[model samples]
Target: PMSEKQLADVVERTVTPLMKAQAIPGMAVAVIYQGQPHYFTFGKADVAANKPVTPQTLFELGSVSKTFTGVLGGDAIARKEISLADPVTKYWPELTGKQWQGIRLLDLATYTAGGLPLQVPDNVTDNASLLRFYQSWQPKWAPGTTRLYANTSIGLFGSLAVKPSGMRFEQAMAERVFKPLKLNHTWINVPHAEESHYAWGYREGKAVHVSPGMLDAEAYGVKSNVKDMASWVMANMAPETLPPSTLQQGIALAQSRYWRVGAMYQGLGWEMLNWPVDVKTVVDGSDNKVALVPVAEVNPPAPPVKASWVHKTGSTGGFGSYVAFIPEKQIGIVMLANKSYPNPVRVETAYRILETLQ
Candidate 1:
């Protein structure tokens, strides 16, 4: 029931004022309810040109790209292209017997690789040197004993996604995930023509384009429009959006929970929790950066599978994004912004909007 009267009450009153107060120069919001999707735009895409944001406008998805890889890794596992219990050394044979011996695919995929550093050393310039860095590195703890979110973990997953096919990682992602789903606008690296719609993220007072650190692609390198991101949300709510394929098989496996961390839970590349947690939990759980911290091993206040709310947040230095949905209710949201805003504000705002929809 997207009747103007039904949606009009929420769209203008709920979303617009929040963008204005936050000074978000431009952003896109997409929501799905009862198996229907609605797209909304706010503010400007190019501040200088005063162009309005559109469903077609692009923004850096930041770390939320992990969820895509998470799904791809899951699909890969389901298709026997990879195995979680198998050692990652199967692909990175360079690691041989060192710390790579027991580091399983699920270990790194779940950010439980036991204290891998945030990223490789800055001096490790290229892939050859990167392999050397891993060979020489040591884990602070045994794999699966603790969770330490690192770009190296998910980055390797991205590599493995295409390793079996011998195609470039990005290319594999397009063929495996995007093409089948018909996500024409989503990309790991934004193409030249699509660059025009890329919104300028604001840092301090000036405009900025997305600048990611090394190996950010495996962790959070997706740039996409609301149309594509919203479609991904719809797929989660309604799996038919992907049709019948290995990609679809992987997406189903992706939702299988890895472990729980305090009030939060981990599923194939997404953070989840039982809905109806107290306000503080929802607000804290929605934070983009800290959400990746390994709070503990195998502990959640409730089962995410039992509750069924899944979400992921991503933030670049200048931009921020958050996507969350409840598949049982067939409701989800995508928020893209030019200026980095408080995560708690996004969580609070999204909850309010969802309540109104309910």
Candidate 2:
């Protein structure tokens, strides 16, 4: 196994090579093992200002924030305040319309509520607009009939928890999950003090920065440094340390394969890459690559997997982040970048680093 410094050095080396080869301005990486964290920083946090990226720098986690929402939902379920099977109308009583009433909480969590699309819809200009949109929006297909990656739908899962729990989603998350785990640097809503440390997001090939809009928080506005995220990875890797039943439910819900999109497998708030592989091999030889399969498809009856690996990726306007963990190995890795890069670049880099680990 590599020492903390050695691991950091490995990441720095990889990042530098990529930076030189691409237009990316800044990046951050963190690894967790045995409940400890190792973090590394590189390049500029803000290219215009010439600020250096550091372990303390905060980056927007985009869709990766959904995992935090998943955490909040799990915590609520753990408290017996709500069940995943409950209908959407149960908590959001104001959703009196026929369309919104049929959507179940489980459908939202797993991204299986038929074809709700991936965005918040143009008509949704504010929080009230969101309620209005959901009120009349009917599913294109029956709930749980197929899989679609819809940010607005999953985000609503977190938003609905507010009324039932009697706490704002952000506050409820802090009180029940983040505070308990001592993740002081993580926040769904960015505050002024940490604003200076925030890394600007970038488009894949553009030099311009991107701005996070209103619904960004529930879907992606999480700002976090390496330390807090590493702690989160550690806690997730060891769910046994939490209340046993809750942990089991969380793990089961998070890892359960729901809908398939081509070669990718969608779990509740997670994606799975499953295939048998030789655990001892380090190189991408026949043994290692043979079982690698992508099950996600655009149409019905998505592909199935033979093995399981749960992962999530996030990007906010200019920032990008990723997290992947193998429960069986009790190992997890996280990467955060100030500038947005091609999704393939982020995914490939994460897999490469993970392969280097035992």
Candidate 3:
């Protein structure tokens, strides 16, 4: 095991080389070991303005915000406010007559619900519209029968908890998790004072812009600094910081592998894999081999390796982020970038860093 200082040095040395080689404008990283956090920033938070990225710069967390929703649900269960196995309609009675009534809350959280697609349809405008959309949407397959990753479905899962808890999902998160953890910099809404720290999200061949719309916080809106996210990684890695029963249930719920989407294994808002390099060649080769291999024969799961790791990756147009933790090793790493790199490139670089740690 590495001491905290040794680990911090490793992060700085490893990340600095990447920043220089990639010409990335700015990036922030955090590492957690033995429950202590070490944070680092390289390059600029705003390259055009010449501002350096720091531990305090807030970058959009994207889909990683789903994990916060998972925390809220876990907290509600801990308080006896809801049950994971209960049908979602139990909390949102308006959904009673809809096709979604049979779907369990856990199915929604775990991405096993077969209704709705990854994004909301163009016509749905607000939360009410979203609710109405779900009311009529029919699942193509039975709930939990197979995995279909859908943001609209997961957002509905968060929304269902809002009414029963008597608070919006964002507020519920603050009260139940963020406030108690003293996570001041982590929030669904970007307040005016911190506007200076926000990074612009970009899409290829388009103008750069700050993420807009209320939905950002609801499903993808969280902005956090490396410092605060480091605390979060520690909480997830070592649940003992929470109440004993809460810790027990949260870990079990989070790590319970509910569905396998092709090679990607889904846990509640998280994904598990043996190791990146172990899967990279297989995934890449499968993509190429698909042209020749029969549909049924193509894309078999990579041979299982002994190393254990769970990770989550996030992207919102221009910004990209990745976080992974080796639970048994008590080690975790976070990476945030202002510009989106190709997924293959990002994953390859991240695995290189992780491989060195072992």
Top TM-score: which candidate number? 1
lDDT of 3 at 126: 75
Ranking by lDDT: 1, 2, 3
Q: How accurate is candidate 2 locally (lDDT)?
A: 0.68
Error of 2 at 52 (Å): 0.9
List the candidate 2 regions with Cα displacement exceeding 4 Å. Answer: 4-6, 204-214, 242-252, 256-265, 275-307
Better of 2 and 3 by TM-score: 2
TM-score of each: 0.91, 0.83, 0.82
RMSD of each: 2.9, 5.7, 5.3
Give candidate 1's error at residue 113 in angstroms: 0.6
In candidate 3, what residue range of length 10 has the lowest lDDT sum? 289-298
Candidate 3 segments exceeding 4 Å error: 1-23, 96-98, 205-215, 243-248, 262-264, 274-307
**What is the C-alpha lDDT profile of model 3 across 1-358, one tens digit per residue?**
6666676677777777776665567789886755677777887777667788889888878877777776666667667777768998787777765566668887777666764567766677776886777777777766666555567767777777656778877888887778777799997887899888876654553426444543455567678999898888877776766667653465546655555544545566666654443648423421211111111111232322224466777777767787777777677878888766555565566566656566
Model 2 over residues 27-134: C-alpha lDDT tens digits? 777877655677777788877788988988888787888877776776677668778779988877778887765688877876667666677865577868777877
RMSD of 1: 2.9
